[PDB]
Symmetry: C3
Amino acid sequence: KIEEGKLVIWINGDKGYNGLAEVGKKFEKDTGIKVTVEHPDKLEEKFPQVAATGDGPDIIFWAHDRFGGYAQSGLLAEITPDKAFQDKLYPFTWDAVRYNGKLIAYPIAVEALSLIYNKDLLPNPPKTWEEIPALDKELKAKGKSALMFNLQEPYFTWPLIAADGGYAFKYENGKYDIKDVGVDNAGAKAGLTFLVDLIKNKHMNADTDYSIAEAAFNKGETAMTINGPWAWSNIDTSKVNYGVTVLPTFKGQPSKPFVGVLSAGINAASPNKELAKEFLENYLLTDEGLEAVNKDKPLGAVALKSYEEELAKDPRIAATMENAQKGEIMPNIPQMSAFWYAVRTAVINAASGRQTVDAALAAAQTNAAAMATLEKLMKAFESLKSFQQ
Amino acid sequence: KIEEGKLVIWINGDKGYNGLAEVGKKFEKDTGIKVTVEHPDKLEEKFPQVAATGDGPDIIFWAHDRFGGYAQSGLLAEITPDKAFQDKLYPFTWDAVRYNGKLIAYPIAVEALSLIYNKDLLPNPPKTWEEIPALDKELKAKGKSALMFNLQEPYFTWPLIAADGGYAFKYENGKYDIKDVGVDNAGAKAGLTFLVDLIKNKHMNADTDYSIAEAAFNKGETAMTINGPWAWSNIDTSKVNYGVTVLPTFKGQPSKPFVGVLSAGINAASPNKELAKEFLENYLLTDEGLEAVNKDKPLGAVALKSYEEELAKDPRIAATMENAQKGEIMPNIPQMSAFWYAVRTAVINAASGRQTVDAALAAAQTNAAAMATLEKLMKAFESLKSFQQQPPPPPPPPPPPQ
Amino acid sequence: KIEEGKLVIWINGDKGYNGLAEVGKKFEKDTGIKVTVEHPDKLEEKFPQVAATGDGPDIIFWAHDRFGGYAQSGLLAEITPDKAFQDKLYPFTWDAVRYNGKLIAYPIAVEALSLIYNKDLLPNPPKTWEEIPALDKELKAKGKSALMFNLQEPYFTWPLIAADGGYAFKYENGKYDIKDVGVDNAGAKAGLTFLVDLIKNKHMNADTDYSIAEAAFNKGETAMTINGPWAWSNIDTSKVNYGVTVLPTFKGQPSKPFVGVLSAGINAASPNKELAKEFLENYLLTDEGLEAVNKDKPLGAALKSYEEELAKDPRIAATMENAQKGEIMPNIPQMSAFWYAVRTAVINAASGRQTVDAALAAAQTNAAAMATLEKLMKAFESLKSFQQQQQQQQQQQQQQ
Ligand SMILES: [Ca+2]
Ligand SMILES: [Ca+2]
Ligand SMILES: [Ca+2]
Ligand SMILES: [Ca+2]
Ligand SMILES: [Ca+2]
Ligand SMILES: [Zn+2]
Ligand SMILES: [Zn+2]
Ligand SMILES: [Zn+2]
Ligand SMILES: [Zn+2]
Ligand SMILES: [Zn+2]
Ligand SMILES: [Zn+2]
Ligand SMILES: [Zn+2]
Ligand SMILES: [Zn+2]
């Protein structure tokens, strides 16, 4: 039901969940200790319930952004690897799995937006953000346009918002700083400034969302979109000749897109911690391990320095990786959830004219901190009340 | 409300804008840039409504205390005055036009509380409290009190409470230690302890606010009262031979009144800021720039050193200026509103005899420091829930102790 | 009223209150000062409301934690014994009577938890928890049990949880750092992890409460229980042959129980301030004074010399020994809320339905919130009760 003498891995239904059980068998063929990968529905939500009673999986596969829940909630064993092993991945990926200093997951793959352009329309794409109105008046003449991506979401509008100085919090020494909301600076100010120009300079429409936009790339009706690897197959179907690259540097400085690291945390309740350790280190995080997990469902950039260079032959993959190095690791705290919506509102207020540049960002910042007290206070009410009962 | 090639100023409609509008033409005369000056009822309320959409006036006049609200709201521009021009203004005012680094406005006119006596009654004032008892009893033999002032207002009583070591928050570099309130302390402890004693020693009363106290002074029923420049009109009308001078000291320290400095800021959204920095830096802050503005309706004292001297000849002004230089450049930070009211509680219960000095003040920490979060938190809740089994119930009431 | 030159003391009915009234005799004698000890009702509710109006006793006896609530609400006079005196009582007792670096009460009695154990079944006590399971084995065979105590309560359990590194709020420099809580740290985990291992390995009994605990010992059906100086009364009564000793250590590291301190404080309003310290330090603190108090109701164990005459009693001896190795019950407001969430942790961690560092981090998270909800709530109250009382007065009086 729960336990011991074998591993019960969890990974989201849509991942290389077979390609992993392929590896999980390579394991059984060497140790004599069985592996059982499962993929239940709401599997990111079930976890805490069953870990609260101390049951479920020995290990958990998921984006790092969620474990800061589990790890805080107390549901992750602080894993210790070896330095000469921690040197087999990439430097930053280990940062996506810190908590209080305590490493709590093994990174697997990477997730980041990259510039996606039409090969049949652009040579050779824009080196920077600064000359994209110049590129656009050329193509708005052909019936087309230069670029189109979502504006009803930070995650997309963030890479540009950051670029020049704007952060979210301050990761310091394995330590996120929740009283340092990196939005109300000239870096994130002049980022957002630049953007809402091409909105009112008519290089982009205000109500441009994920679907309406996406579709228009292919087509080829718009010349560029900013999107992540999870999009490719739709474009692949359109035939539409496309390439992928490092995002347009802004003010000379590289863009800062969020980084989503597929992780594999080991359960605090797991009695098989050793076995899992071995499984992940000796078998999964080998090349041919991720040669088996990619080959079911592509992983984008992987964490293994080792087995990134073999996948790097693919141009589309190398750009993802470079981007995710010039990227900015997505935070994993509670405050995150709450931060999102303020900026989600800030940009939606700036894009519309409801407010301006310097205003909406103040409105998030101070807010962000204040609103957080409400979310934190409510947590007590829920925890308090419940108990009393 | 724009563009572009002209500025639009707003100023309170009791302030001498005619003098400011008189700069309008004399400035418009040398540059061509037409200037229209407006007194829009509720501007200090209205301004954010418009400022935060890409509008408003181009530059704004108001007390520095409300300029915190604006700067945080990212509404005012960081202005960088060339460049040893700061030396042509009083050093302390620049600690009313600053926000976590950002020098957020141009300070014009210093207001502040002062000591006004009845020259015709008590010819030469006390420079200390202590002898106020001695004085009430002295004049009582003529059927008049000695001092009477708004007890009901901390703003008016704070000077005293603070005198010995009390403070709002610890300022020290465009920065206040928001957590560190100074109403706890041993300074303020002994401060109010005096004021309290004054009431029960029969010297003065509890029901002593503006109305009663102005009536009482303006008829010559008391020797001295504590008031700002605003009352000046009314005592002139009630034909008294009055005199404003520096506030009585207590326990050997100057009284720390509350310094409010009229500042002029610039809409951070406005297309033409460079003009305000020629208008304000080059024209409005002159001798006959401020002069004219003052000459409509008196500014109070002035943040400028030069025309301060010219005005300092009138003692009343010189006293106001001096009082400010003994005071605390009133915190513009937003939990100041919470600070306020939670002493207006403390000083009353202590005054009524319902509580003691040491009790109230201490509890004041609870008045401010939690109402601070509740004030801003209660505001955030709406903004979030406003624009944008099935759980345990909503407050605004949460739960009781056990 | 409020006194005026006479000493009204306020001790609780169950403390040495006739014996204290006796020291009000040698004091008066050669100082000529009228002294009334009177034992009121729930004086930790009466005091803060008479204190508020400058009324009440000139002197209040009581545990220091409620004294927190008072010193906090600015109700108590900072007092000074000299450095020559300071060195008179034990140092650790000083770190209990210190709000914001300001020394606010005089300590007279310590109240710590003990290993209270039956000599007839276990004539040499366990010095370690580690063996406690392996001991139950031998005891179960004899028809009896090894150890019982109220699990449905932190105050008892904490001492073990506290063992390896578990603290409430981090004591550092005269003030208990409120943000630094230490229920999560690995040390505490270990502390509870052991208690749960005991409760699920059936050495313990889940719904073991106080009655079930001491009564199973006072009847003589378990080798040991964990209690304090209050319980002695009855163990004696049933003739149970007992000693009391130092509790057991965990990882060679010693058990760490909460120290409570029966303390005398001085009303900040109290008109007759100077008399009090002359009364206390020079007449009460004295050996015979304390003896006299004790000579009515035993105070248990706090004066570093007079201690010895009592300490001849081994059971009192251990209470001290224990309390020296112990954490002190801190006095600020966050404490009360802490107790609620630490209860949670233990109580359902015992139930398997929360495991384990789970219940033990969610506590650290309840604490952070049940904290700044508790403060915020008590402001909102203190407001809507002095904005109302105001209107009522504004309307009541006004009207006609
Ligand atoms: Ca299953
Ligand atoms: Ca190794
Ligand atoms: Ca107009
Ligand atoms: Ca009585
Ligand atoms: Ca003796
Ligand atoms: Zn499924
Ligand atoms: Zn353009
Ligand atoms: Zn291969
Ligand atoms: Zn008007
Ligand atoms: Zn007197
Ligand atoms: Zn002149
Ligand atoms: Zn002149
Ligand atoms: Zn066992």
